[PDB]
Design an enzyme around this catalytic site. Structure first.
Site, PDB file in Angstrom:
ATOM      1  N   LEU A  13      50.740  45.333  11.053  1.00  0.00           N
ATOM      2  CA  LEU A  13      51.728  45.418  11.975  1.00  0.00           C
ATOM      3  C   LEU A  13      52.982  44.389  11.608  1.00  0.00           C
ATOM      4  CD1 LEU A  13      50.073  46.236  15.570  1.00  0.00           C
ATOM      5  CD2 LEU A  13      50.772  47.824  13.892  1.00  0.00           C
ATOM      6  N   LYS A  15      53.597  40.805   9.000  1.00  0.00           N
ATOM      7  CA  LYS A  15      52.938  39.628   8.229  1.00  0.00           C
ATOM      8  C   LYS A  15      54.257  38.356   8.276  1.00  0.00           C
ATOM      9  CE  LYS A  15      50.008  40.825   4.885  1.00  0.00           C
ATOM     10  NZ  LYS A  15      49.840  41.066   3.588  1.00  0.00           N
ATOM     11  N   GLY A  16      53.809  37.294   8.306  1.00  0.00           N
ATOM     12  CA  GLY A  16      54.808  35.951   8.283  1.00  0.00           C
ATOM     13  C   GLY A  16      54.159  35.187   7.298  1.00  0.00           C
ATOM     14  N   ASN A  17      54.927  33.707   7.386  1.00  0.00           N
ATOM     15  CA  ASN A  17      54.200  32.763   6.657  1.00  0.00           C
ATOM     16  C   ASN A  17      52.964  32.079   7.216  1.00  0.00           C
ATOM     17  OD1 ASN A  17      56.950  30.712   5.038  1.00  0.00           O
ATOM     18  ND2 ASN A  17      55.710  32.287   4.233  1.00  0.00           N
ATOM     19  N   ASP A 130      61.733  31.318  20.151  1.00  0.00           N
ATOM     20  CA  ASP A 130      61.770  32.388  19.084  1.00  0.00           C
ATOM     21  C   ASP A 130      62.162  33.587  19.637  1.00  0.00           C
ATOM     22  OD1 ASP A 130      61.332  33.043  16.368  1.00  0.00           O
ATOM     23  OD2 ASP A 130      59.201  33.433  16.697  1.00  0.00           O
TER      24      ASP A 130
END
Ligand SMILES: O=C(Nc1nc2cccc(-c3ccc(CN4CCS(=O)(=O)CC4)cc3)n2n1)C1CC1
Length: 283
Positions: A13, A15-17, A130
């Protein structure tokens, strides 16, 4: 509540760091009758990142609001955060896809639900840090939810701000100037970011109109970016009024984008103004 062996991966769904969210089926009777759920995990698990994740989980678990994604449980072999799955996905992608079907009256309904979710946060002394349409989720045509809390902090008892500078990549184009220059995060920097979210909505997520693209054009298309950003904002440089945006919605945006932290409206006054604009568009 959840067993790792009964959780079937369906798709990625996001992906990040430091994180990843998956669509999974939780099927403890193994008869393909379990509910589809969203599963967040760390992608490269440090032990600091794990401690932060544990706190993120405790934050989400403590929140119960119509406009906040529901906590379902945890799962470990390890740590996984299990949430409700929202079938329409991020407000960002949803706005982009259905822009011809979503009018301004709808944008302000979403806006007003985001304020109520954010006011409920500030009630628990949570700072989100955020706010962006990529972190807002669509439950249905009439309902949005704040859907990620990875950067969310609790205010200390004796202070109305929280200071923190995490390593790597910060969403600088949603950051208030005192967050860029002093790492100070408060209800008011969340209000600043909310102004940028409102800008996003009214741009209908037009590729060349995003805050990164607009501030980069204003600065001039690495480490120097934040410095030039800071200067631009101190000089009252700001995101242009989106195409078709009313003067009165843009007024709300620009009020959110006050350099004077204390002059920015509160979330409940934002909700009053937006709900008033909504009724003056209907009745
Ligand atoms: O996305 C869908 N449903 C859905 N339900 C939920 C329930 C909870 C959370 C999410 C969700 C929230 C944010 C993201 C973006 N981002 C991924 C990397 S990170 O650093 O981990 C967090 C930030 C991705 C998914 N979602 N998303 C439908 C369109 C396919």
């Amino acid at each position: 509540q959840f067993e790792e062996r009964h959780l079937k991966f369906l798709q990625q769904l996001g992906k990040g760091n430091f994180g990843s969210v998956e669509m999974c089926r939780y099927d403890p009777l193994q008869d393909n009758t379990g509910e589809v759920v969203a599963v967040k995990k760390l992608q490269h698990s440090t032990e600091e990142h794990l401690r932060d994740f544990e706190r993120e989980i405790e934050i989400l678990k403590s929140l119960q609001h119509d406009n906040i994604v529901k906590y379902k449980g945890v799962c470990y072999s390890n740590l996984k955060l299990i949430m409700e799955y929202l079938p329409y996905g991020s407000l960002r992608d949803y706005l982009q896809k259905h822009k011809e079907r979503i009018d301004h009256i709808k944008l302000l309904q979403y806006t007003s639900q985001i304020c109520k979710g954010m006011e409920y946060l500030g009630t628990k002394r949570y700072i989100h840090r955020d706010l962006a349409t990529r972190n807002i989720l669509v439950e249905n045509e009439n309902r949005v939810k704040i859907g990620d809390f990875g950067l969310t902090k609790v205010l200390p008892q004796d202070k109305e701000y929280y200071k923190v500078k995490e390593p790597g990549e910060s969403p600088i184009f949603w950051y208030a100037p005192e967050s860029l220059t002093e790492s100070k995060f408060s209800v008011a920097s969340d209000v600043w970011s909310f102004g940028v979210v409102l800008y996003e909505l009214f741009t209908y997520i037009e590729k060349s109109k995003s805050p990164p693209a607009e501030f980069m054009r204003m600065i001039g298309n690495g480490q120097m970016i934040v410095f030039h950003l800071i200067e631009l904002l101190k000089n009252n440089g700001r995101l242009p009024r989106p195409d078709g945006c009313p003067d009165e919605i843009y007024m709300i945006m620009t009020e959110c984008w006050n350099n004077n932290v204390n002059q920015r409206p509160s979330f409940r006054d934002l909700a009053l103004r937006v709900d008033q604009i909504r009724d003056q568009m209907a009745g």
